[PDB]
Write a protein that binds this ligand. Structure first.
Ligand SMILES: [Zn+2]
Ligand SMILES: [Zn+2]
Ligand SMILES: [Zn+2]
Ligand SMILES: [Zn+2]
Lengths: 96, 36, 39
């Protein structure tokens, strides 16, 4: 009878309305899906408690992050800081 | 002088280069042959 | 790869079992810190 939803609303990768089956990590704001949350380079699945980068279309891991950046835009030098990286938070739970 | 700082993430016996030091903690017991 | 294990190194695990300290466990060897109650 009752419908309890506490997510953003629409996806940032697909046109599917986010329901109680997203099972995604707490991103900056725009949330994705359990399938729409993949690397834009190696396409590997993300971990928990690790670092990652957010782009315009998809996201990037910490494995090919040093490559994706240089092939797109952004290089702080060979050993120099090019910016900041975020850590994947805890996966959103539908109840608990 | 001396070692003091173990700047290594890949043991000779195992020959497996790790990325996280937290994983190496348990590795240096059951994985490095047997460090029990 | 995505991450390494303390006992194996199955990067194909569905979800890495991470604790408070950071003991990255695949999913199989991770039971060692529960069933056996080891480190
Ligand atoms: Zn989606
Ligand atoms: Zn990647
Ligand atoms: Zn070893
Ligand atoms: Zn394992």
């Amino acid at each position: 009878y009752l419908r309890l939803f506490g997510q953003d609303g629409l996806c940032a990768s697909c046109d599917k309305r986010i329901r109680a089956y997203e099972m995604t990590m707490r991103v900056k704001d725009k949330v994705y899906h359990l399938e729409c949350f993949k690397c834009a380079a190696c396409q590997k699945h993300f971990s928990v408690g690790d670092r990652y980068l957010l782009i315009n279309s998809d996201i990037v891991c910490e494995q090919d992050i040093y490559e994706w950046t240089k092939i797109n835009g952004g290089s702080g030098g060979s050993g120099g800081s090019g910016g900041d990286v975020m850590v994947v938070g805890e996966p959103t739970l539908m109840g608990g | 002088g001396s070692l003091l700082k173990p700047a290594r993430f890949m043991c000779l016996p195992c020959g497996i280069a790790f990325s996280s030091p937290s994983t190496l903690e348990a590795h240096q017991a059951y994985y490095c042959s047997h460090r029990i | 790869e995505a991450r390494e294990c303390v006992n194996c190194g199955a990067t194909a695990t569905p979800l890495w079992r991470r604790d408070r300290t950071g003991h990255y466990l695949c999913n199989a060897c991770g039971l060692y810190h529960k069933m056996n109650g080891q480190n």
